């Protein structure tokens, strides 16, 4: 039982380390993507170089959106909009000059 | 690579070998997954040794 | 890379567009008209030579 536990943990400990891995940000998928679907540069990466001190505030003005893509214009997305129905539940789009 | 291949351009060149490059983006998924197969074997030959 | 960047610039903006060839006596005369056809198409410039 006790290893086992520490296995549940360590399995836990690696896939969160994963999500903390790669390329920018937590992951390349869908949002990486929309950085080529559209013209959607990731915010976390648009602040990649963001102060230790600024972060927290980052983070949290942010919110969710944190981890949002911006993307000049999101009227443009909406022709491909109805593809994704394989993207996080939940998805942050964002206008401006990335 | 645009440059030099319009500079030689033509059928018979480096270009319409090197279009894999010049067309073609680079990916960093397949980098770090062959990576990550790399770590796991080296793991299993460190246990097997 | 125009398709890409039109859409993250100004949209009033439209980029040049200019490409080369050395050793341009490769091409005839009718080489030099359809290039040109085409060249004017698409709003291109020339340094052929």
């Known amino acids: 039982v006790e290893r086992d536990e520490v296995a549940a943990q360590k399995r836990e400990l690696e896939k969160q380390i994963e999500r903390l891995s790669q390329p920018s940000g937590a992951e390349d998928s869908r949002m990486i993507a929309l950085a080529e679907r559209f013209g959607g540069v990731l915010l976390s990466e648009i602040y990649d170089d963001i102060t230790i001190d600024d972060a927290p505030y980052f983070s949290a003005l942010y919110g969710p959106a944190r981890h949002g893509i911006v993307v000049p214009d999101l009227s443009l997305v909406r022709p491909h909009l109805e593809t994704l129905e394989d993207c996080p539940e939940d998805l942050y789009l964002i206008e401006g000059d990335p | 690579r645009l440059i030099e291949a319009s500079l030689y351009g033509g059928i018979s060149s480096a270009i319409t070998r090197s279009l894999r490059d010049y067309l073609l983006p680079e990916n960093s998924g397949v980098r770090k997954a062959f990576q990550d197969m790399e770590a796991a074997l080296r793991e299993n030959r460190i246990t097997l040794e | ?49």
């Open chain 3, 1 to 49: 890379w125009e398709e890409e960047s039109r859409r993250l610039r100004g949209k009033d903006i439209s980029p040049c567009r200019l490409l080369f060839l050395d050793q341009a006596a490769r091409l005839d005369a009718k080489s030099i008209a359809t290039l040109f056809e085409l060249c004017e198409r698409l709003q291109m410039q020339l340094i052929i030579a």
